[PDB]
Design a protein around this motif. Structure first.
Motif, PDB file in Angstrom:
ATOM      1  N   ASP A  11      39.825  35.171  53.441  1.00 30.38           N
ATOM      2  CA  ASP A  11      39.202  36.525  53.453  1.00 30.38           C
ATOM      3  C   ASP A  11      37.847  36.580  54.150  1.00 30.38           C
ATOM      4  O   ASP A  11      37.113  37.596  53.985  1.00 30.38           O
ATOM      5  CB  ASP A  11      39.003  36.978  52.007  1.00 30.38           C
ATOM      6  CG  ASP A  11      37.989  36.105  51.248  1.00 30.38           C
ATOM      7  OD1 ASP A  11      37.647  35.008  51.693  1.00 30.38           O
ATOM      8  OD2 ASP A  11      37.576  36.491  50.155  1.00 30.38           O
ATOM      9  N   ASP A  14      37.256  39.436  56.596  1.00 32.17           N
ATOM     10  CA  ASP A  14      37.661  40.809  56.115  1.00 32.17           C
ATOM     11  C   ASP A  14      36.580  41.848  56.408  1.00 32.17           C
ATOM     12  O   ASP A  14      36.924  42.990  56.855  1.00 32.17           O
ATOM     13  CB  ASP A  14      38.016  40.851  54.646  1.00 32.17           C
ATOM     14  CG  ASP A  14      39.363  40.134  54.329  1.00 32.17           C
ATOM     15  OD1 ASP A  14      40.016  39.650  55.247  1.00 32.17           O
ATOM     16  OD2 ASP A  14      39.756  40.064  53.145  1.00 32.17           O
ATOM     17  N   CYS A  18      37.252  45.027  58.674  1.00 32.87           N
ATOM     18  CA  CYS A  18      37.147  46.432  58.108  1.00 32.87           C
ATOM     19  C   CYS A  18      36.134  47.277  58.925  1.00 32.87           C
ATOM     20  O   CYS A  18      36.380  48.465  59.215  1.00 32.87           O
ATOM     21  CB  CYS A  18      36.814  46.448  56.685  1.00 32.87           C
ATOM     22  SG  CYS A  18      38.167  45.893  55.621  1.00 32.87           S
ATOM     23  N   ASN A  70      36.271  44.000  47.759  1.00 29.44           N
ATOM     24  CA  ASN A  70      37.332  43.338  48.522  1.00 29.44           C
ATOM     25  C   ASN A  70      37.971  44.368  49.480  1.00 29.44           C
ATOM     26  O   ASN A  70      37.622  45.568  49.447  1.00 29.44           O
ATOM     27  CB  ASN A  70      38.406  42.801  47.543  1.00 29.44           C
ATOM     28  CG  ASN A  70      38.930  43.868  46.633  1.00 29.44           C
ATOM     29  OD1 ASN A  70      39.429  44.929  47.064  1.00 29.44           O
ATOM     30  ND2 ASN A  70      38.815  43.623  45.356  1.00 29.44           N
ATOM     31  N   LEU A  71      38.863  43.904  50.354  1.00 28.71           N
ATOM     32  CA  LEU A  71      39.392  44.836  51.406  1.00 28.71           C
ATOM     33  C   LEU A  71      40.238  45.982  50.731  1.00 28.71           C
ATOM     34  O   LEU A  71      40.334  47.078  51.313  1.00 28.71           O
ATOM     35  CB  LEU A  71      40.156  44.035  52.527  1.00 28.71           C
ATOM     36  CG  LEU A  71      41.641  43.728  52.175  1.00 28.71           C
ATOM     37  CD1 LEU A  71      42.326  43.246  53.443  1.00 28.71           C
ATOM     38  CD2 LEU A  71      41.716  42.662  51.090  1.00 28.71           C
ATOM     39  N   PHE A 114      46.137  43.105  58.874  1.00 33.44           N
ATOM     40  CA  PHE A 114      46.149  42.377  57.596  1.00 33.44           C
ATOM     41  C   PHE A 114      47.567  41.992  57.065  1.00 33.44           C
ATOM     42  O   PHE A 114      47.657  41.124  56.212  1.00 33.44           O
ATOM     43  CB  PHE A 114      45.392  43.161  56.494  1.00 33.44           C
ATOM     44  CG  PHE A 114      43.877  43.265  56.735  1.00 33.44           C
ATOM     45  CD1 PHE A 114      43.061  42.136  56.770  1.00 33.44           C
ATOM     46  CD2 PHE A 114      43.274  44.499  56.962  1.00 33.44           C
ATOM     47  CE1 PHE A 114      41.702  42.261  56.968  1.00 33.44           C
ATOM     48  CE2 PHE A 114      41.921  44.613  57.204  1.00 33.44           C
ATOM     49  CZ  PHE A 114      41.133  43.535  57.217  1.00 33.44           C
TER      50      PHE A 114
END
Length: 115
Positions: A11, A14, A18, A70-71, A114
């Motif tokens: 991650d 990420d 994003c 988190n994503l 993703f």
């Protein structure tokens, strides 16, 4: 469970990824309804009806200040933007169509990046 873990999904990129997605959404020609928070003083009904307002500028500030753990919490806020748009706007309006277009655009970038 305790001392029993699935393998570690990387991650570490990420946040960057994003941010790239969000840049693409910000620069889409149909992003204009979503760039800034709806003006709650000037748009009758919005404050009462839309319990959780969300916009791209607010997501950008949250992203930049470590407020997404988190994503998935990031994707939830992006989808909130479009869910709010569908709640308030007819499908056959400029804004209603913009929101569909943008949701489609997002969900493809999301899958391709993703999944």
């Amino acid at each position: 469970s305790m001392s029993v873990k699935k393998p570690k999904r990387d991650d570490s990129k990420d946040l960057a990824l994003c941010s790239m997605i969000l840049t693409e959404m910000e620069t889409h020609e149909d992003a204009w309804p979503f760039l800034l928070p709806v003006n709650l003083k000037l748009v009758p009904g919005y404050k009462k009806v839309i319990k959780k307002p969300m916009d791209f500028s607010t997501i950008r500030e949250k992203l930049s200040s470590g407020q997404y753990p988190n994503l998935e919490t990031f994707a939830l806020d992006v989808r909130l933007v479009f869910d709010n748009c569908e709640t308030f706007n007819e499908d056959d309006s400029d804004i209603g169509r913009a929101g569909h277009n943008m949701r489609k655009y997002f969900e493809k970038k999301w899958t391709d990046t993703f999944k």
